[PDB]
Structure 1
C-alpha cells in the first residue's frame, strides 16, 4: 500500500516538482484546484492525508477542511500556504491542523510532516525498543552500585522514565527485563533502608527530607516570600509514577517551579506520615505533646482527625501570623463543593486541601473486580489515574486557584505497591505491624525492637515494629490461604519500597 495524498491548491500546476519528489518517495498524490473537487475526491476515495492551500478561488482551505473533517475526522490535514498572517495561523491551529507549512516550501519539509504525522507512533516504538536495549545493561549496573538515598532517587527517576516509555512498546521481553530491574531495585532499596533508617535519626547524621520535616523545610520558605497565596494540596497515596502520568495535564494550568523527591517516614501509612507533615513532629512527639490529638493503632476511630489543629500549632510554633484554612476531601460532593466555593478562599494566604480518592481507589482493587480490570498492571493504574485527574474535582480546585493567582504546592504522604508474595505473621496495614508477641520472617521484614529510636510510639518497651520489604504482604497464619487469595496482587502501603517511600514535592507558579 502506498500512502495516498490529496493536495488541493489553485496553483497546483506550479507545485509539480514537489509532487515528483513525493512520487519517488512512493507517495501517491491526487491533485485538485478547487475545494469542491477536493470534497468530491475526499468522499469518493480513501486518502491517508490531505494538503490544503488557504487562499483558493472558491472554497477556502479551512472551509474545505471543516467539510472533510465532518466526514472523516481521523484523516490528518496539513496546510501549505503563502499566508503568513498570525490570525490565519491561529484559525487553522484551532481547526486542528496537523501542520502548517509556509510557501515556498522545502520538499523535504513536506516529507518531515508526512513522516511526523503518519509514522510517528511506529518510529517512537522502534526508537524506544532500541534505545532501551542499549540501556538496560547499564541500568542493571547502576542499581548494583547504588549507595546513597540521592543515588536511589536518581535511579528511581531512570526506572520511572523507562516505565512510561515502554508502555508504548509491544516487546514483552524488554518489559519483563524492566520489571526484573524494578524488583531488584526494591530488594536492594529495602536492605539499604534496613541498614540506614535508624541511623538517620542520629543527631546531624545526613538524612533526606522526610515526612515530619516537610512543612518547616520546604513550605515555610514559600510563605516567607509573601508574594502569592498558596494552595497546599496533599493527595494521599500518590505513587511517583501516577504523578508522572498526569504531569502534562497540570502543565496546561501550572508551570513547575520546583520538584524535590522526599522520603516518607516509616510506617508509610496515613496515620503516621500525614500527621507528621502537619505537625512537624515525629509520631512519638505527637503522642507526647498532643495526647488530645494522637491516636495509637489500638485506639478506635480516625487517626488523622486533628491535622488542622497540629498544623495551626506548627504555624504558631514557627511564629507566622497568617490567614490559614484546612479542608479534608473524602468524597466527590466535598471536592465539588470546595471547587464551586474556592472563590471565598481568596483572602486566605494559605489553603491546605487533603484529597483521599487515590488511596480509596488503590484499596478498591482489593474489593472490586471493576478496579481489578481497570488497574490490572501499573500502566493500567497510571491510565486510570490520568482518566481520574483529567476529570477530577481536584483539577477544578486547581484551575480555580490558578484563576485566583495562587501558587500550587502538590505533594503526598506515601505511595503503594502491588504486593505479590506472602510472609507469615502472628501477633492492620499488611506491610507494617506493631506489638509485643510478634512472630515474623525476619529475612522478609525490617524489625525495630526499640520504636522510640525511630521516633515511633511504643505502647510497652516490649512493643516493636516490623515493615515488609519488596512486594511482601504480611499474612496471619490463621486463615493463611484465604489471606493470600484475597490480598495477592493488591495495592498495600505501610512498608518499604521505592513506590511507597520516595514520593514527590512539587511547587507551581500560576500561568
Structure 2
C-alpha cells in the first residue's frame, strides 16, 4: 500500500516538481484544482492525508477543510499556501490543521511533514526502545550504589521517567528488563528502610521529611508568606506515577512552584499516616495527647474522622492564627457540592480538602470485574486515573481556586502497590520488617509488622482464598517505592 495523498491547489500544474519528487518516494498523489472536486474524491475514495492551498478561486482551502472534516473526521490535513498572514495561520491552527507549510516550499519539508504526521508513532517506539537499550545498564549500576534517602528519590524519578516512556513499546525483552529493575529497586529499598527507619526516630538523626513533619515543615512556611490563601488537597492513596499521568492537565490551570518527594510513615495506611499529616505527631503521640480522637486497630466504628480537630490543634501548637476550614469528600455528590459552593471561603486563609475517590477506586479492583478490566496493568490504571481526574469534581474545585487566586498545595498520604506474592489490611521472615518495640518507631502498641516488595499477608486459615482473591490487587500499608515515596507539590495559579 503506497500512502495516498490528495493535493488540492488552483495552480497544481506549477507543482509537478513536488509531485514527481513525492511519487519517486512511493507516495501516490491524486490532484485536484478546486475544493468541490476534492470533496467529491475525498468521499468516494479513502485517502491517508490531504494537502490544501488556502487561496483558491472558488471555495477556499479552509472552507474545503471544513466540509472535509465533517465527512471524514480523522484524516490529517496539511495546508500549503503562499499566505503568510497571522490570522490565516490562526484560523488554520484553530481548525485543527496538522501542519502549515509556506510556499515556496522545500520539497523535503513536505516529506518531513508526511513522516511526522503518518509515521511518528512507530518512530517514537523505535527510538525509545533503542534509547533504553543504551541507558539501562547505567540504571542497574546507579541502583547498586544508592544508600541515601536523597539518592532513593533520584532513582525513583528515573524509573518513573522510563516507565511512562516505555509504557507504549512492544519489545518484550526491554519491558522485562524494566520490570526487573523495579523489583530490585523495592527489594533494595526495603532493606534500606528496615536498616535506618528506627535510627531515623533517634535524636540528631539525618532523616527524610515524613508524615508527622509534613504540615510543620512544608505547609506552615507557605502560609507565613501571607500573600495569598492556600488550597490544600490531600488525594488519598495517590502513586507518583498517577500524579505524573495527569501533570499536563493540571498545568493548564496551575504552574508548579515547588516539588518535594517525602516519606510517609509506616504503616502506609490512612489512619496511621494521614492522621499524622494533620496532627504533626506520630501515632503513639496521638494516643498519648488525644485519646478521645485516636483510634487503635482493634476499635470498631471506622477511622480518620477527627482530622479537623487534629489539624486545628496543630495550628495553635505552632502558635499560628488563621481562618481554617476542613472537608472530606467521600462521594460524587459530595465533591460536586463543594465545587458549586467553593465561592464562600475566599476570606478563609487555608482550605483543606481530603479526597478519597482514588482509594475507593484502587480497592474496587479487588471486587468488581469491570474495574479489573479497566485497571488490568499499571498503564491501564494510570490511563483510568487520567480519565477520572480530567472529569473529576476535584478538578472543578481546583479550577475555582485559581479564579480566586489561591495557591495550591497538592499531596497524598501514601501510594498503593500491585501485590503478587503471598506471605503467611494486607501489608501491616525476610518477607517482613518486624518492630517488636513500637515506641522506637513512635507507633502505639501494648506490651508492628510491614510487608516488603510484592508481599500480601495471607492468614494460614483460608490461605488459598486470601491468595486467590487478593493476588494482583492494589494494597497499601507496607514498604515500597510506590507506597512510601509520595509527592508534595506547591503551585501558583495561572
- Which TM-score band (shorter chain)? over 0.9
**In the aligned structure 2, how far is the partner of 1:227 from the partner of 1:101?**
47
TM-score normalised by L of structure 1? 0.94
**In the aligned structure 2, how far is the partner of 1:397 from the partner of 1:157?**
28
Deviation of 1:85 (Å): 2.8
Match of 1:489 in 2: 472
Deviation of 1:44 (Å): 2.2
Deviates further, 468-477 or 398-407: 398-407
Deviates further, 314-323 or 405-414: 314-323
* Deviations 1:365-396, CA, capped at 9 Å, x for gaps: 11111111111111111111111111111111
* Deviations 1:388-407, CA, capped at 9 Å, x for gaps: 11111111111111222221
Deviation of 1:103 (Å): 2.7
Deviation of 1:230 (Å): 1.4
Question: What is the count of residue pairs matched by the alignment?
Answer: 494
Cα distance, 1:399–1:180 mapped onto 2, change above 3 Å: same
Which among 426, 443, 447 is matched to residue 430 of structure 1? 426
* Deviations 1:470-492, CA, capped at 9 Å, x for gaps: 01111111111111111111111
**In the aligned structure 2, how far is the partner of 1:342 from the partner of 1:105?**
53
**In the aligned structure 1, how far is the partner of 2:97 from the partner of 2:296?**
59
Deviates further, 182-191 or 18-27: 18-27
Cα distance, 1:176–1:227 mapped onto 2, change above 3 Å: same
**In the aligned structure 2, how far is the partner of 1:370 from the partner of 1:43?**
39
Deviation of 1:257 (Å): 1.5
Deviates further, 342-351 or 263-272: 342-351
* Deviations 1:121-142, CA, capped at 9 Å, x for gaps: 0101111111111122222222
For residues 248-259 of structure 1, the aligned pairs below 5 Å read 248-259=248-259
Deviation of 1:359 (Å): 0.5
Which among 481, 485, 489 is matched to residue 502 of structure 1? 485
* Deviations 1:116-168, CA, capped at 9 Å, x for gaps: 11101010111111111112222222212211112111111111111111111
**In the aligned structure 1, how far is the partner of 2:18 from the partner of 2:227?**
55
Match of 1:87 in 2: 87
* Deviations 1:13-33, CA, capped at 9 Å, x for gaps: 333333333233222222222
**In the aligned structure 2, how far is the partner of 1:411 from the partner of 1:89?**
41
Give the 3-state SS of the residue equivalent to 1:58 in structure 2.
Answer: coil
Match of 1:452 in 2: 439
Give the 3-state SS of the residue equivalent to 2:244 in structure 1.
Answer: helix
Give the 3-state SS of the residue equivalent to 2:440 in structure 1.
Answer: helix
Deviation of 1:353 (Å): 0.4
Unaligned 5+ runs, structure 1: 433-441
Q: Does 1:466 align with 2:453?
A: no
Could you say what the CA RMSD is over the residues aligned between the two structures, in angstroms? 1.4
**In the aligned structure 2, how far is the partner of 1:54 from the partner of 1:252?**
31
**In the aligned structure 2, how far is the partner of 1:14 from the partner of 1:256?**
51
**In the aligned structure 2, how far is the partner of 1:79 from the partner of 1:107?**
14
Deviates further, 4-13 or 389-398: 4-13
* Deviations 1:47-71, CA, capped at 9 Å, x for gaps: 1111112222111111111111111
Deviation of 1:321 (Å): 1.9
* Deviations 1:457-504, CA, capped at 9 Å, x for gaps: 1223xxxx1100001111111111111111111111100011100011
Match of 1:78 in 2: 78
Give the 3-state SS of the residue equivalent to 2:242 in structure 1.
Answer: helix
Deviates further, 30-39 or 238-247: 30-39
Cα distance, 1:345–1:16 mapped onto 2, change above 3 Å: farther
Unaligned 5+ runs, structure 2: none
Match of 2:169 in 1: 169
* Deviations 1:203-259, CA, capped at 9 Å, x for gaps: 121111111111121111221222222111000000111111111111222221121
Deviation of 1:108 (Å): 2.1
Deviates further, 85-94 or 466-475: 85-94
**In the aligned structure 1, how far is the partner of 2:406 from the partner of 2:458?**
46
For residues 326-405 of structure 1, the aligned pairs below 5 Å read 326-405=326-405
Give the 3-state SS of the residue equivalent to 2:167 in structure 1.
Answer: helix
Q: Does 1:155 align with 2:159?
A: no
**In the aligned structure 1, how far is the partner of 2:72 from the partner of 2:121?**
20
Deviates further, 353-362 or 55-64: 55-64
Deviates further, 235-244 or 28-37: 28-37
**In the aligned structure 1, how far is the partner of 2:177 from the partner of 2:47?**
40
